[PDB]
Amino acid sequence: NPPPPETSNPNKPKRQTNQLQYLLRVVLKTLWKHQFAWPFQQPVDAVKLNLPDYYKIIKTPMDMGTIKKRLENNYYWNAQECIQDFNTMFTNCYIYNKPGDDIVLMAEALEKLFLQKINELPT
């Protein structure tokens, strides 16, 4: 396994915004409880899951456990930065797999719920 994505970085500028607060309290914590959330709650363990090709294909890994810790650590500058991490997580799934796979059906449903929840954010 590669090292997991960082969740802290002292020289990176931090910020707390209403939208980032909402992304943790509402968006992530709601997605987390979905029946299809479990494959996305932690970095992919290529050794445990027997996916030796995973990090040969996926060069910008991301998962909701990392995102949750980044939100809790006020790692992001703005909501768009966190939204980009969700989008990276979803697109990684589509890239590593192919249409119709169970894991892709799961990501497709989670992506639709995610878009529903970020359609309107606080001001």
Ligand SMILES: COc1ccc2c(c1)C=C1c3c(ccc(OC)c3O2)C(=O)N1C
């Ligand atoms: C307990 O956490 C788990 C357990 C098994 C899981 C995953 C995470 C997450 C996966 C995953 C993918 C592809 C194949 C796969 O299994 C063949 C798979 O399995 C994939 O793209 N992601 C994100």
